[PDB]
Ligand binder design. Structure first.
Ligand SMILES: N#Cc1ccc(O)cc1F
Length: 283
């Protein structure tokens, strides 16, 4: 079926939970043996969210190459993404090592450091220009260059220096700051505006390594971001945009990382975002 009318048909019939459970039943199951080794317990935020072995990002280190991060490669859309958990106190250096090694231009953050009164990820970037951060375990230095605070999101320019080679690179930090503590946003308008700002920066384009996207677990809000982006790109590329099937795209993405889209409300919100976004691309 088309999307917008499949949408109204699920709303009128109140069957979002049944649709979402079908997706969960059909999703791929692949091994995640490296994630579950005992030496990696303090590298995982949640015991039930792990990268598959076949798609995990490897750190260029001979001691321990593990990080909770997955490469999502979308062949028809010609887009790639790295989805990862919010960094932990003992993985902030690994996080920036990955950004460096994979040649990423942008980092997309969809959570606040504290939500619901608890810490959802480490304070992994510097908050003042004159107070830089040094990660001694991976030999990297990170400096805040500028910050632009808007009503729904903040954009930061950062400098990452590889202290071994003295090479430097500019990284863009796109921080969506207004996702509610419970539920999903009422309108997709500010999320779409944010997606378009990431696109306009070059961070999603083939001349750079894959964008790094995270929330707390790296599957829920993060899944919504890449699902919406890929669906809108396919609608631009194809002769028949109504042929784009969001449930099929989500199942393809779940071949590369488990659990993408965590609730039926997040599924409905993804439909809403793609529907409204398709009108702005042209309406
Ligand atoms: N990209 C892409 C893509 C194309 C067709 C499909 O059924 C699912 C997909 F993710």
């Amino acid at each position: 079926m088309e999307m917008e009318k499949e949408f109204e048909q699920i709303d009128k019939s109140g069957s979002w939970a049944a649709i979402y459970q079908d997706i969960r039943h059909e999703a791929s199951d692949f091994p995640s043996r490296v994630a579950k080794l005992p030496k990696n317990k303090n590298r995982n935020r949640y015991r039930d969210v792990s990268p598959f072995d076949h798609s995990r990002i490897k750190l260029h280190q001979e001691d321990n190459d593990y990080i909770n991060a997955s490469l999502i490669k979308m062949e028809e859309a010609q887009r790639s993404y790295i989805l990862t958990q919010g960094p932990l106190p003992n993985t902030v250096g690994h996080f920036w090592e990955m950004v460096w090694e994979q040649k990423s231009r942008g980092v997309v953050m969809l959570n606040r450091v504290m939500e619901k009164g608890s810490l959802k990820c480490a304070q992994y970037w510097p908050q003042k220009e004159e107070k830089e951060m040094i990660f001694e375990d991976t030999n990297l230095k990170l400096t805040l260059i500028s910050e632009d605070i808007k009503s729904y999101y903040t954009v930061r320019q950062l400098e990452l220096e590889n202290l071994t080679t003295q090479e430097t690179r500019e990284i863009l930090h796109f921080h969506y700051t207004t996702w509610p503590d419970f539920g999903v946003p009422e309108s997709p308008a500010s999320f779409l505006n944010f997606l378009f700002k990431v696109r306009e920066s070059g961070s999603l384009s083939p001349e750079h390594g894959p964008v790094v996207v995270h929330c707390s677990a790296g599957i829920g809000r993060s899944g919504t971001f890449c699902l919406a982006d890929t669906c809108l790109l396919l609608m631009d590329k194809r002769k028949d945009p109504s042929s784009v099937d969001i449930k099929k795209v989500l199942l393809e993405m779940r071949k590369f990382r488990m659990g993408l889209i965590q609730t039926a409300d997040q599924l409905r919100f993804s439909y809403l975002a793609v529907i409204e976004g398709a009108k702005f691309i042209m309406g």
